[PDB]
Amino acid sequence: TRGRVIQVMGPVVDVKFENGHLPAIYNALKIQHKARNENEVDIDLTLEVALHLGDDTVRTIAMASTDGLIRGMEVIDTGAPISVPVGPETLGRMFDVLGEPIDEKGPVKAKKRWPIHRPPPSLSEQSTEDEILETGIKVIDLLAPIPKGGKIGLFGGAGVGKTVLIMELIRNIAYEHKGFSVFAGVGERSREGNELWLEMKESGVLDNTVLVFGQMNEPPGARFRVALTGLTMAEYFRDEEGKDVLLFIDNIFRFAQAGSEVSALLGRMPSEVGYQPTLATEMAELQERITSTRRGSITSVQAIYVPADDLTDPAPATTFAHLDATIVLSRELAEKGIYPAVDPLQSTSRIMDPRIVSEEHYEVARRVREILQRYKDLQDIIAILGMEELSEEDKLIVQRARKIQRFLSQPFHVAEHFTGRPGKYVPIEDTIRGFKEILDGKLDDVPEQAFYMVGTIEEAVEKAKKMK
Amino acid sequence: SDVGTVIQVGDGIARAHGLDNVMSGELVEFANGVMGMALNLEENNVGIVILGPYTGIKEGDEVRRTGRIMEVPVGEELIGRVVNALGQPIDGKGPINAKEFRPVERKAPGVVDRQPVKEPLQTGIKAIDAMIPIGRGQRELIIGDRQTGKTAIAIDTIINQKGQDVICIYVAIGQKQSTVAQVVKTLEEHGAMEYTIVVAATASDPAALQYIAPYAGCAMGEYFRDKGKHALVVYDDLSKHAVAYRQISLLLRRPPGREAYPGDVFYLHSRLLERAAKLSDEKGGGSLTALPIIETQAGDVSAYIPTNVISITDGQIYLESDLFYSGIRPAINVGLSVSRVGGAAQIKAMKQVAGKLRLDLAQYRELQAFAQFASDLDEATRAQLERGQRMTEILKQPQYSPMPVEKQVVIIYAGTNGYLDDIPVEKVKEFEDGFLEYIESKHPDILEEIREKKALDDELEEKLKKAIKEFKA
Amino acid sequence: SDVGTVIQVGDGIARAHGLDNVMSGELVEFANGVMGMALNLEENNVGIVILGPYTGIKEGDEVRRTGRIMEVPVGEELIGRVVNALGQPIDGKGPINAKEFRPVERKAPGVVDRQPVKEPLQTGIKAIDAMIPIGRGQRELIIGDRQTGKTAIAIDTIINQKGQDVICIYVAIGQKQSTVAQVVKTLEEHGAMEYTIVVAATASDPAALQYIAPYAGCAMGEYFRDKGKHALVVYDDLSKHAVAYRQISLLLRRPPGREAYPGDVFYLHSRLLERAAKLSDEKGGGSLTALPIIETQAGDVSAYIPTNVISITDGQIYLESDLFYSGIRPAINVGLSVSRVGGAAQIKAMKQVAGKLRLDLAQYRELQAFAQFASDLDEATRAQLERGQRMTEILKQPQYSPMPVEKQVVIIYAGTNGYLDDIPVEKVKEFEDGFLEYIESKHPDILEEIREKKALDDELEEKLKKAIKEFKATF
Numbered sequence A: 001t002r003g004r005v006i007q008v009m010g011p012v013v014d015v016k017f018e019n020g021h022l023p024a025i026y027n028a029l030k031i032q033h034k035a036r037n038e039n040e041v042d043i044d045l046t047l048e049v050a051l052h053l054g055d056d057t058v059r060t061i062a063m064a065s066t067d068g069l070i071r072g073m074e075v076i077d078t079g080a081p082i083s084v085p086v087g088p089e090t091l092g093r094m095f096d097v098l099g100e101p102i103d104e105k106g107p108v109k110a111k112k113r114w115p116i117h118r119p120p121p122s123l124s125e126q127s128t129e130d131e132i133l134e135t136g137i138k139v140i141d142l143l144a145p146i147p148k149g150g151k152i153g154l155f156g157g158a159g160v161g162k163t164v165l166i167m168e169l170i171r172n173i174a175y176e177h178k179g180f181s182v183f184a185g186v187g188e189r190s191r192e193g194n195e196l197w198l199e200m201k202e203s204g205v206l207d208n209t210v211l212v213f214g215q216m217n218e219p220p221g222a223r224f225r226v227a228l229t230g231l232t233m234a235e236y237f238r239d240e241e242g243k244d245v246l247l248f249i250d251n252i253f254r255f256a257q258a259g260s261e262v263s264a265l266l267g268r269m270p271s272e273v274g275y276q277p278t279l280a281t282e283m284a285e286l287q288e289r290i291t292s293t294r295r296g297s298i299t300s301v302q303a304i305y306v307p308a309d310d311l312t313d314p315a316p317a318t319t320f321a322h323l324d325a326t327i328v329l330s331r332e333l334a335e336k337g338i339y340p341a342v343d344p345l346q347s348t349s350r351i352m353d354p355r356i357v358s359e360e361h362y363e364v365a366r367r368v369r370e371i372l373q374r375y376k377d378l379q380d381i382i383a384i385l386g387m388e389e390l391s392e393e394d395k396l397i398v399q400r401a402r403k404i405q406r407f408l409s410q411p412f413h414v415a416e417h418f419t420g421r422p423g424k425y426v427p428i429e430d431t432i433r434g435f436k437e438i439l440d441g442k443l444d445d446v447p448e449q450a451f452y453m454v455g456t457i458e459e460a461v462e463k464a465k466k467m468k
Numbered sequence B: 001s002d003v004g005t006v007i008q009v010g011d012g013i014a015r016a017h018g019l020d021n022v023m024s025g026e027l028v029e030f031a032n033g034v035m036g037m038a039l040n041l042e043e044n045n046v047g048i049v050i051l052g053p054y055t056g057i058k059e060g061d062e063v064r065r066t067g068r069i070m071e072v073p074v075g076e077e078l079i080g081r082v083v084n085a086l087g088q089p090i091d092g093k094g095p096i097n098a099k100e101f102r103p104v105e106r107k108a109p110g111v112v113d114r115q116p117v118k119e120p121l122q123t124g125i126k127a128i129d130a131m132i133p134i135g136r137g138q139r140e141l142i143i144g145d146r147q148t149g150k151t152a153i154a155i156d157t158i159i160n161q162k163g164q165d166v167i168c169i170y171v172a173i174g175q176k177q178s179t180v181a182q183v184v185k186t187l188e189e190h191g192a193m194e195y196t197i198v199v200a201a202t203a204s205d206p207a208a209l210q211y212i213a214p215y216a217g218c219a220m221g222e223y224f225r226d227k228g229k230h231a232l233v234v235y236d237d238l239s240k241h242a243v244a245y246r247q248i249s250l251l252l253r254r255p256p257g258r259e260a261y262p263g264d265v266f267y268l269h270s271r272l273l274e275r276a277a278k279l280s281d282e283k284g285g286g287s288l289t290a291l292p293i294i295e296t297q298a299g300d301v302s303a304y305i306p307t308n309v310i311s312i313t314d315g316q317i318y319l320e321s322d323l324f325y326s327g328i329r330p331a332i333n334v335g336l337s338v339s340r341v342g343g344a345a346q347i348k349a350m351k352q353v354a355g356k357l358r359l360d361l362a363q364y365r366e367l368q369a370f371a372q373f374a375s376d377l378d379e380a381t382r383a384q385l386e387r388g389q390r391m392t393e394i395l396k397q398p399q400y401s402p403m404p405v406e407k408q409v410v411i412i413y414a415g416t417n418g419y420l421d422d423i424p425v426e427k428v429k430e431f432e433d434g435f436l437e438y439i440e441s442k443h444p445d446i447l448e449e450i451r452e453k454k455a456l457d458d459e460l461e462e463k464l465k466k467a468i469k470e471f472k473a
Numbered sequence C: 001s002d003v004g005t006v007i008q009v010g011d012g013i014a015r016a017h018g019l020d021n022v023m024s025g026e027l028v029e030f031a032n033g034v035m036g037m038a039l040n041l042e043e044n045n046v047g048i049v050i051l052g053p054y055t056g057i058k059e060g061d062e063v064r065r066t067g068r069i070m071e072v073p074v075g076e077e078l079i080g081r082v083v084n085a086l087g088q089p090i091d092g093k094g095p096i097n098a099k100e101f102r103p104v105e106r107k108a109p110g111v112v113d114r115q116p117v118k119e120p121l122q123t124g125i126k127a128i129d130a131m132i133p134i135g136r137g138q139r140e141l142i143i144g145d146r147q148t149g150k151t152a153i154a155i156d157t158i159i160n161q162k163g164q165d166v167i168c169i170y171v172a173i174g175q176k177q178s179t180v181a182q183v184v185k186t187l188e189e190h191g192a193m194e195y196t197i198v199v200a201a202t203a204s205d206p207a208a209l210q211y212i213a214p215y216a217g218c219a220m221g222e223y224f225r226d227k228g229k230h231a232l233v234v235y236d237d238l239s240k241h242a243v244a245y246r247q248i249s250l251l252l253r254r255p256p257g258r259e260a261y262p263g264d265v266f267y268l269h270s271r272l273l274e275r276a277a278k279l280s281d282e283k284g285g286g287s288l289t290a291l292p293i294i295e296t297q298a299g300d301v302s303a304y305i306p307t308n309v310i311s312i313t314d315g316q317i318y319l320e321s322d323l324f325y326s327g328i329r330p331a332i333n334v335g336l337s338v339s340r341v342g343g344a345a346q347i348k349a350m351k352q353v354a355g356k357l358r359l360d361l362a363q364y365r366e367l368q369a370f371a372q373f374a375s376d377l378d379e380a381t382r383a384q385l386e387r388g389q390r391m392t393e394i395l396k397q398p399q400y401s402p403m404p405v406e407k408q409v410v411i412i413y414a415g416t417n418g419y420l421d422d423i424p425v426e427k428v429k430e431f432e433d434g435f436l437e438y439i440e441s442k443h444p445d446i447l448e449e450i451r452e453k454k455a456l457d458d459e460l461e462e463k464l465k466k467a468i469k470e471f472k473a474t475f
């Protein structure tokens, strides 16, 4: 049943086997070799079967560094895909891509191991729940309400605020629901991952949480399969235990790039901007499993890196079809000091219908999006002609749009090191009441600077009093 | 021999030795029981595209030719049900007892087998039915950026076919299982499932199924056309269908062209969309109309697949991300959208009022380039600006709110003849509903006459009956 | 068996037959004495990257296995010396008798092997130490157009580390030999060579050495961290490191992606920058800070390689070519520059005054860009437009002039609380020099308290001691 290494090309390794004893696709293989003399190095490596080539040969992707491999090394077949522990024994533990523990706590000893590749729920198992998840974040709770059991996607370039926004959502939602939580950290920073683990270990929240990481510095085999390890652990709580769970992923773009790095070495023809021909199929294998069924529910918050600030790129472009809510972060807002920097004209959700939200909520959100679009359509005219040449209506529309764009700003609890302010939580009632009061012109005699970094409208009014 | 064996296996593609007498496009069966299409015939191998889970197929497995072309079940029995790209049920309501089967690949009706399209396909949408008309055998494209209202126009159009003899086929290509289920509950909520067939290739399904889906939905629509009935076919997104074909062609090693797509891609959509037609009286007078949808990246209408399908269709509806956030809710670019069949598709009453609306909007588009200043514009220019702003408002309509053709005529007539001109711009939307409730509640004879004659010519009463409403409301 | 024979040679790449027992990443020796890395292992041949002058290598030459993964010498012996990317000396001061060797490729420390960063690495620059704090273990990017002062900020940092036990490494990648000599003499003039190591791979050296340079410098810095000491590493330009990898990858015929760079280009920089960390107390508490540098064409911060490295680091310092010609130094654009570790690494006295300053200096840019004239705005807007001008003056600072943390706290406390609002804008710089000399010459009790306590307890003495200077014929 055993085989031998024939070629090594970076992350890709080719293996040849005996007559008719070939392993299936997605099947795991093992390399365990001890140095025979001082010119060799000890190796412990796992390979995943990618395709059949002919001449009893198979092409594979390595899960760790291929340094030290030699042509002719013996390889063993495990008979099944990468299998990871599942169950309540996995709560409060940190894991590697292969489901082995990162923490110094000891062996997990779980009762069952599940394969990383499973078919998604059929059309008859789907759910159609229309329930609003309140986040306490003034921009999302108004313009892009989060559906329970749906997918919410955070799109942004480098350093716009995706991680600061994910961590504020983790803090606010996991506080009151007390359900099981999972965080994957596919492209999560080891420094941030350490800051998260310490807070969860001291606050006790870790006892209900599963963690899988898979750092930036890892080879593409790990960056490609790590999102599926966290998802396979979150699926057990939905399928076999019937619970409602939160699944956080700091970067699904890294999962796409890891497939791109692999594709040239596999022998495939490239597509647009050098990507793999299979890009939409691979994103759907991950995203179709993240759904709520008649047994239980999976709600997910995901961050998507946008390379070179271009949303037309194949990876971000392919992802939009799968999300129930989409939040886009703009550098123009970040460079102007307005945080969380969410773009009001490109952010949307499935739930923003007159049949799912109140008449007062629908009307306020409509009036906000419209006044900001009218202000966007005038920044050229205000540049070519003096502001004293604009009509009274346009003059008021500019002042109201100016107040609104900064009243959308809020100091987060997870950002006290950057904002220099305590941090605030705002209920939906005060968000709607707040924007309605500005839109209706009751606050025309208040400076724009009073609306920046305040949680609620009553605060803006005392912030105006603190300045004669 | 007719037995082949597998020599390579990848992402839904396999290659085999043997199969010397296989024909181009034939179905082939693997030893695991799964099926695939023989697409490329080489000197020493056959390129097979798999129609199911490929992970069970290995090098050295036996593969056999079936001697059969790909076919799907058809008939009245598919109405009010949900099926996959091969016609198999997925709604959980049991088996389908269809009596006939039709190949998904058939030739379109010839030049002499057709007749000119002269009857309307009401969408119930005031911007489409007045300015971008659809006839009962025409191909119209819905095109624009993501989240602009593309499916809403197709679904509102399917819901309006209740009191009309049209079978509706909705084909979902590369959609999430969750959005398919959400659309199916909306169709049941409005009762559209009493005459609707749903075909769905999900994003999780192999590229071969997302490729077969539009052709299967077309074969089901053709059955009704061949028997003298009317049918409507919607393709939720042809952009994902092109991407699915790009995937198979690149994995089969066919040489790429423009925007990485295969040269064969124009023939892919033209061989599909030319099957929608109105037949001659010798053939039975039956009809099939199509509503394909395309998504543009950041407004690029000049891209390969968009320009390719824009050249195939008989008209295009353009949706703007700009109009949508500005409060023009259906979000249609009336100064760019076009239908060749316009006039011939509409009824005599609708055409008359469409005309004045067209001149008013064209003039307003000419004036708005320099409408930035209005306190300086001549009072005459203001008349053009004011009329244009009001005609724009009449076109605004809430989702799932089709207006009946007699009412669309009655309101466009009022705006074009200046009867809505005197009403304030913000108050126009309120006045529209109030006037339509007034005309239906008392003296309903105006709405009854327009349904029967379809030609107006009775306006003296409509004018006098309108003055009684405007006197105090 | 451990000997092969060359079959093809080109612009720094070779192919050889044999070498059956070679291992992926092993160093290999040519008959001429030059060395190369075995990258690709094929059915019948091995692909080699040459680490020196290839013009002496011919087809049919005998190549041999070294039996070692690519490694570099490390230890105390490298301090006060100049070496190439292979660790060999170029200062002319004799051989290096280092006792330990370390592979240049190693995995970064895990989530549990680390601890939070809290001890401040003072740079001596008022805009960085206030708005963009740096700590031991952080990774800060220095970014801007060519000819903007990026090397000056790195060299000013390697000098402010005078009375600390920090070990500095400077890695020159794709730089001119003349600029390397000017950096080494500047370090000797200020005495920084008593605690510095210089690694060089200049513009004329083969691209394979410009590829190994950051990894070799990282291995030398890790030695100090693995033993509980603190280290710092500078990478003179990662933009040139990327161009060198693009050259090697295109010559191996790998298919390109965005801007012709290879798909592997993110893994290149992320595998190097994640090795900078602050270890846990069980591992020894040691640290390794990193200061990579990047060059923008025409200020295009949005380009592929720039945004790619910004996505890996803990913060960005952006330098403007436009402000630099307007007489402004260091010319840092605070509206774009920020740190992810910031606020936590900075001392408490500085947190008490710098906290709100970055967001204020970001909205300041909007107001000065939006205000069409000076005569039409209201009193509420005039009051905040003036404050940003005075703070911008306080933030200006000349070259080779480090200012200690205790002095930075007093002047920022004066500006952030409005004590400069009566002084004209052209006189603010005179105020800063006169005020700091006044406090040091007759109130050393304020600066000495901040030096020992690291926090502001009672401000009452500083408010009165400051007001006395104002009454005493201010500028």
Ligand SMILES: Nc1ncnc2c1ncn2[C@@H]1O[C@H](COP(=O)(O)OP(=O)(O)OP(=O)(O)O)[C@@H](O)[C@H]1O
Pocket (backbone or CB within 6 Å): A349, A350, A352, A353, B145, B146, B147, B148, B149, B150, B151, B152, B153, B295, B329, B330, B397, B398, B399
């Ligand atoms: N006429 C309308 N009035 C109000 N809201 C509308 C209208 N038409 C569409 N919408 C809203 O626009 C949003 C997007 O609609 P829809 O899903 O049909 O757009 P789409 O372009 O097809 O999006 P996608 O590309 O994701 O499939 C939905 O929230 C829908 O309710």
Ligand SMILES: Nc1ncnc2c1ncn2[C@@H]1O[C@H](COP(=O)(O)OP(=O)(O)O)[C@@H](O)[C@H]1O
Pocket (backbone or CB within 6 Å): A156, A157, A158, A159, A160, A161, A162, A163, A164, A165, A339, A340, A412, A415, A418, A419, C311, C338, C339, C340, C341, C342
């Ligand atoms: N809500 C916020 N409040 C204040 N500062 C923020 C906020 N969001 C982002 N920032 C700043 O910008 C950076 C955001 O980092 P991060 O969230 O990791 O960016 P990204 O993941 O998008 O690359 C931090 O340095 C932080 O100081």
Ligand SMILES: [Mg+2]
Pocket (backbone or CB within 6 Å): A161, A162, A163, A164
């Ligand atoms: Mg982040």
Ligand SMILES: [Mg+2]
Pocket (backbone or CB within 6 Å): B150, B151, B236
């Ligand atoms: Mg849709």
